[PDB]
Amino acid sequence: MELIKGQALFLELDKKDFLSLKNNDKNIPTFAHPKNQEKILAIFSLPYKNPPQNTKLIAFYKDKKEEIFIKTLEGNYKSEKLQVENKKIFPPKTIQERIAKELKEANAIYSSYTPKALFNGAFNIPLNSFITSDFGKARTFNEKVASYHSGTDFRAATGTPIYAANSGVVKIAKDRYFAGNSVVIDHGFGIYSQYYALSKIDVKVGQKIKKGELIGLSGASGRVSGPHLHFGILAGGKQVDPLDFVSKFNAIFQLEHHHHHH
Ligand SMILES: [Zn+2]
């Protein structure tokens, strides 16, 4: 199969006698296919930056193995030559420490896997606006990607209500470097939605949040590009194209429903 860098796919496997799914000694979790009881699903994501050229996954069964080849596609993201190259920044030492501390926190949060659906059917858009700057716009040096937009931006006047794109559990709700005021929601199955640059946070860590429920107010009045909501999705351990992920997720789960029981 084929996958564009920085996107996720939902891999389908036979359920009977399946034991584990691996990528070079990394284990990939599985979950039920909601519409075919004989199938299970797994989420595989390619990183946007410096991805492998090909990927071989092995599904181990009780008495056989199945190989799955994924070729990485470059896609057709918007890209611009970064003319300095130098791209090494020197934050003051106090900023460096805060960035490192928030990175260790985020890394641990994203690897704490929830093995059940916290979501409620389809994802909805977190506000009924439009994209102003989409995922994956890249800045290249000679021709390796130096940086890229790791989420998608919606137009929003400062103070616009922002709603949970799906049900789940709030894992982050605080001011972080780069992301500003941010909310991160665990939806289960290693899927997290991200809401950055907020002007107001209206939830607490560990709160159960319903789809369409208010999580804060849009902000970023003073950003490099002015007020907007930055929306992100992390799935399969990587930032992925969020609208492309939502489209793929909804095709599978949109006829399902769940209200929190725990
Ligand atoms: Zn953004």
Q: What is the DSSP letter of 255?
A: T
State in Å: Cα 253 to ligand 1 middle. 27
Distance 197 CA to ligand 1 centre (A): 8
Classify residue 89 by burial, with Cβ atoms within 10 Å: 0-12, 13-18, 19+: exposed
Q: Residue 182 C-alpha to ligand 1 middle, in angstroms?
A: 12
CB atoms within 10 A of CB 181: 20
Query: What sign results for the dihedral spanned by CA atoms 160, 183, 204, 201?
Result: negative
HSE-up of 73 (CA within 13 Å, CB side)? 10
What's the reported resolution, in angstroms, to a tenth? 2.1
Distance 232 CA to ligand 1 centre (A): 8
Structure determined by: X-ray
CATH 3.40.190.10 fits 79-254, yes or no: no
Residue 13 contacts by C-beta under 8 Å, 6 or more apart in sequence? 21, 30, 39, 40, 41, 42, 59, 66
Distance 150 CA to ligand 1 centre (A): 7
Q: What tokens does 5 get? A: 């860098």
